[PDB]
Amino acid sequence: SKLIVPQWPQPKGVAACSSTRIGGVSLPPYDSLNLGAHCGDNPDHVEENRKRLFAAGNLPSKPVWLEQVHGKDVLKLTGEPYASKRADASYSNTPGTVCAVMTADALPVLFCNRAGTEVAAAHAGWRGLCAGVLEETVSCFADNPENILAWLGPAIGPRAFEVGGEVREAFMAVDAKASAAFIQHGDKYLADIYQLARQRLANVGVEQIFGGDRCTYTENETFFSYRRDKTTGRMASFIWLI
Ligand SMILES: CC(=O)N[C@H]1[C@@H](OP(=O)(O)OP(=O)(O)OC[C@H]2O[C@@H](n3ccc(=O)[nH]c3=O)[C@H](O)[C@@H]2O)O[C@H](CO)[C@@H](O)[C@@H]1O[C@H](C)C(=O)O
């Protein structure tokens, strides 16, 4: 359907999906399954798209949408209501609870342990990726990273992700080896976000890494892209214990 199913050795206890722009009600340039409430779309259309998502994904409960600020804070999903959802990642060990990260070029990373008793979702735009959102998400697991699986969701691929030296400086400041992921391209660099994610995951001992095959910018029939469209919708990536 509209939904991507992660190609990873997913535990029996785990369910996951990642939305596309297909199968909603929003008009261009939000066309059609826009899940974003802060990008200037009709709030009634977004509401209806979030309902279509809930049904298409057979989610057991409403996704816990975060107040994403492109940082490295993780929200442990211990039960609604929540005082503050100011975070760029969520962690769950609670059956039926849905971790959700909202993107349109930023890397969504979905995580679970081999046992299929812990899950998480992280929003890794370059700012949060650089800051350590993936490392902070992995550090919320009780299980050792050797037993953690990660799935690199649809993000802006290295064909498309032109950045200035400012972004390269920021990553190399934290871990010089990030240099490998930035390739000179005119007066700017092409950044490999999947490569930077693989670096950070390896840094905390996550070795079992899947996905990384998509490009939100290039695959315009399937994804919104902030870089491509500027005014556009948002996809989201979801994981839960069944
Ligand atoms: C992290 C990521 O993939 N994208 C995020 C990033 O956009 P980005 O597109 O990178 O914009 P920039 O940060 O302003 O710029 C980052 C670097 O890239 C250079 N550049 C930018 C645009 C261009 O055409 N050419 C070019 O070279 C610029 O000069 C700087 O060095 O920042 C936006 C807020 O400003 C976020 O909304 C967006 O998140 C999305 C929605 C999401 O959460 O899914």
Residue numbers in the entry: 2 to 243
What does the paper say about this structure?
YfiH is a PG-editing factor whose absence causes misincorporation of l-Ser instead of l-Ala into peptide stems, but its mechanistic function is unknown. Here, we report the crystal structures of substrate-bound and product-bound YfiH, showing that YfiH is a cytoplasmic amidase that controls the incorporation of the correct amino acid to the nucleotide precursors by preferentially cleaving the nucleotide precursor by-product UDP–MurNAc–l-Ser. Our results show that YfiH forms an extended L-shaped binding groove for the UDP-MurNAc-monopeptide and is a cytoplasmic amidase specific for hydrolyzing UDP–MurNAc–l-Ser, a noncanonical reaction by-product from the MurC reaction.
Based on the genetic observation that the absence of yfiH leads to the misincorporation of l-Ser instead of l-Ala into PG, our crystallographic results suggest that YfiH may prevent the incorporation of l-Ser by specifically hydrolyzing UDP–MurNAc–l-Ser (UMS) as the preferred substrate. The cocrystal structure, determined at a 1.86-Å resolution, shows that Gln69 indeed forms a hydrogen bond with the side chain hydroxyl of l-Ser of the substrate, whose carboxylic group forms a bidentate salt bridge with Arg235. Moreover, the measured specific activity of YfiH on UMS was more than 10-fold greater than on UMA. Removing the side chain of Arg235 significantly decreased the hydrolytic activity. The results show that the activity for UMS, but not for UMA, was significantly reduced in both the Q69A and Q69M mutants and that the activity for UMA was affected in the Q69A mutant.
